[PDB]
Design a protein around this ligand. Structure first.
Ligand SMILES: NC(=O)c1ccc[n+]([C@@H]2O[C@H](COP(=O)([O-])OP(=O)(O)OC[C@H]3O[C@@H](n4cnc5c(N)ncnc54)[C@H](O)[C@@H]3O)[C@@H](O)[C@H]2O)c1
Ligand SMILES: [K+]
Ligand SMILES: [K+]
Ligand SMILES: [Mg+2]
Ligand SMILES: [Mg+2]
Ligand SMILES: [Mg+2]
Ligand SMILES: [Mg+2]
Ligand SMILES: [Mg+2]
Ligand SMILES: [Mg+2]
Ligand SMILES: [Mg+2]
Ligand SMILES: [Mg+2]
Ligand SMILES: [Mg+2]
Ligand SMILES: [Mg+2]
Ligand SMILES: [Mg+2]
Ligand SMILES: [Mg+2]
Ligand SMILES: [Mg+2]
Ligand SMILES: [Mg+2]
Ligand SMILES: [Mg+2]
Ligand SMILES: [Mg+2]
Lengths: 171, 51, 110, 71, 39, 58
RNA sequence: CCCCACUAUGCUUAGCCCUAAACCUCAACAGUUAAAUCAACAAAACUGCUCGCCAGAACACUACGAGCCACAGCUUAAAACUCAAA
RNA sequence: ACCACGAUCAAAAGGGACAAGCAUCAAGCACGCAGCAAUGCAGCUCAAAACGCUUAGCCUAGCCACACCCCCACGGGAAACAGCAGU
């Protein structure tokens, strides 16, 4: 998070803000503001770090960064409010909307898609091909079918050496 | 002969495209000039209010 | 020029790269619905040999038939990547584009 | 509108709930037996797999769990 | 329904016709077991 | 042309175009921006369509 | 049904259960007010587009199967016999 | 006739296409790829219907299948009209 002494986004570029009294600096800092003001500073930090034009807020990159800041705020909210179903819905919807943005950015501008992933620390994931419950019967059977495959592979390798050994003896 | 005629038709359409794009930059630059002026006044006004 | 493979040239979208030197490509064709007389996409999967493993999931590729299949399901090789995913080059102008917008103007090189 | 269709459904559901109430001990014995057969049918399906693959016994360390018991 | 839905579902499937008491046959041979009257 | 694969692509580039792939390996790019649908059909008929004589013979 | 008393329960906490006449009984989005205004009533009549759903009644918010922290449960959901209606 | 350095006809093999009903058959369980090999990777099919059950000879100048049964027919059961007439 930005330091609490950080000035608000509105008062950072006023001339003479560095020569005012310390009390005036406290009143124009993040310490004396609500959390939404800290999120505006975070968004601007990511914009300058990632996007080519930090002032283009309608680009697909800026929307991903803006929504990524909202997503992080919901996660912090839900860390303290674990039964807040309203904000849990907002988080899951926001993650889905960003994935749609990342999908559309990956298809149109891959170089920018890579910088967004590195800058925001997003590991893009491709969606599953099928949506179907993995119930107990399927989970148990799939595990058995993998064990059976693993055992068959071992037996097939012990039928390569014995055949190899016998062939050498003939010579 | 038909492939060469098609390559020539594409070059003709490209010359029209380059002419069309030049006329759009002149218009884009005019708009971009006004928007910057308007945006500068709105910033100076906002900056004065904060100051 | 002869080949035992039915599909000689096909365009498709890469949907898998988990096999070594093989790209899984979804090819769609238009098929007429006899009752509705409307065309609907019909998709088929083709394995394509990708020696340099240059195919990425989502890019449009052109596949060429091999003289004889090289594997049970590999009957084609990658002939050309038509549209690299997120790195499309406009064929009409040769300039890079991001969707319907140019990344470099055609007026740069006149 | 009238509620005559709801009334038909109402009586059907009342009589069903009452029927289940009267026979809840027989139905519980029947349900127990079905779950046993369901478990046996499941164990057979897994045994078919390793036997059709050439193995003579279950994979080393494999115990088929009871996936239908209340526990 | 939409065209996409009509395509996806396909042409309607008739219910398999229900054979009657003759089992889809014109006549059947029978052996009389008992006679009686019905109201 | 039931055996010719036709694949469509939306909003991938700034301008619309047709591209034909021939068995020889040649590619035919047809720029269609600013052209009406009737002119597009007449264009590809000229460069890649069978003439009326070839069809009469068949 | 009326009167009195009192319990589970209504509350909190942590887990479940996953139903409602959960109903504006009006699916989402976009568009129109000119055509014929329009079976009726409801709530003026429609167009585009998409998904979901329906195909006589009753059997049936049932049977069987499958899934589920549900075990007198929920979800999905038939058939036979019967009728000329509903 | 023979050579056919071919034509015709047409197997095997390879690629593609190809019935109906049921999704209360939803997962299949090795179904993939690379490599000369050794061997390595862990993949392949599937709600655009895989896998499965049931039904049915088919697209009729005709075609497919079968030929007492065990899909096959070394072998076995057993002793064969689904050739014509006939019972
Ligand atoms: N089943 C899938 O995993 C899947 C995959 C791709 C596309 N779809 C699309 O979903 C729609 C429903 O398909 P259906 O009628 O075969 O399924 P369905 O509604 O009968 O549901 C059967 C299975 O598919 C899942 N499913 C249902 N709706 C889905 C949806 N919209 N997207 C993804 N999974 C869904 C269900 O959870 C269940 O596992 C169709 O438009 C289909 O093209 C489904
Ligand atoms: K209501
Ligand atoms: K036989
Ligand atoms: Mg009743
Ligand atoms: Mg109390
Ligand atoms: Mg209270
Ligand atoms: Mg309500
Ligand atoms: Mg909807
Ligand atoms: Mg009915
Ligand atoms: Mg109910
Ligand atoms: Mg029930
Ligand atoms: Mg049951
Ligand atoms: Mg053959
Ligand atoms: Mg379904
Ligand atoms: Mg059933
Ligand atoms: Mg038969
Ligand atoms: Mg006989
Ligand atoms: Mg035989
Ligand atoms: Mg005879």
């Amino acid at each position: 998070d930005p330091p609490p002494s950080t000035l608000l986004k509105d008062y950072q570029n006023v001339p003479g803000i560095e020569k005012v009294d310390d009390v005036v600096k406290r009143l124009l800092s993040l310490e004396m503001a609500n959390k939404k003001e800290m999120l505006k500073i975070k968004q601007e930090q990511f914009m300058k770090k990632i996007v080519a034009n930090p002032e283009d807020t309608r680009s697909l990159e800026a929307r991903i960064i803006a929504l990524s800041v909202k997503i992080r705020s919901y996660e912090e909210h839900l860390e303290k409010h674990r039964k807040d179903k309203a904000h849990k819905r907002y988080l899951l919807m926001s993650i889905d909307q960003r994935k749609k943005m990342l999908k559309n950015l990956r298809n149109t501008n891959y170089d920018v898609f890579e910088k967004i992933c590195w800058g925001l620390g997003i590991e893009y994931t491709f969606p599953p091909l099928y949506y179907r419950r993995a119930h107990r019967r399927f989970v148990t059977k799939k595990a058995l079918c993998i064990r059976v495959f693993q055992e068959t592979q071992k037996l097939k390798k012990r039928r390569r050496a014995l055949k190899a050994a016998a062939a050498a003896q003939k010579q | 002969e038909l492939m060469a005629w098609n390559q020539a038709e594409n070059r003709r359409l490209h010359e029209l495209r380059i002419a069309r794009l030049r006329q759009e930059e002149r218009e884009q630059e005019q708009r971009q000039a006004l928007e910057q002026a308007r945006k500068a006044e709105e910033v100076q006004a906002w900056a004065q209010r904060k100051e | 020029v002869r080949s035992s493979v039915h599909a000689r040239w096909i365009v498709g979208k890469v949907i898998g790269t988990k096999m070594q030197k093989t790209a899984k490509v979804r090819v769609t064709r238009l098929v007429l619905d006899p009752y509705l007389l409307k065309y609907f996409n019909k998709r088929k999967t083709y394995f394509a040999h990708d020696a340099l493993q240059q195919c990425t999931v989502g890019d449009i590729v052109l596949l060429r038939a091999l003289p004889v299949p090289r594997a049970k399901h590999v009957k084609h090789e990658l002939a050309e990547i038509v549209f690299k995913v997120g790195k499309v080059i406009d064929p009409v102008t040769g300039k890079p584009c991001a969707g319907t917008t140019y990344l470099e103007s055609p007026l740069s090189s006149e | 509108k009238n509620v005559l269709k709801i009334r038909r459904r109402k009586m059907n559901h009342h009589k069903y709930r009452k029927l289940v109430k009267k026979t809840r001990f027989l139905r519980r014995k029947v349900q127990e037996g079905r779950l046993r057969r369901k478990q046996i049918k499941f164990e057979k399906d897994l045994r078919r797999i390793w036997l059709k693959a050439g193995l003579k016994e279950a994979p080393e360390g494999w115990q088929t769990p009871k996936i239908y018991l209340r526990g | 329904a939409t065209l996409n839905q009509m395509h996806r579902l396909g042409p309607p499937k008739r219910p398999p016709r229900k054979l009657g008491p003759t089992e889809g046959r014109p006549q059947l041979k029978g052996v009389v077991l008992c006679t009686f009257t019905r109201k | 042309n039931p055996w010719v694969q036709i694949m469509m692509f939306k909003n991938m580039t700034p301008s619309p175009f047709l591209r034909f792939y021939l068995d020889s390996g040649e590619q035919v790019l047809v720029d269609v921006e600013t052209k009406s649908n009737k002119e597009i059909m007449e264009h590809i008929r000229k460069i890649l369509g069978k003439n009326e004589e070839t069809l009469r013979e068949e």
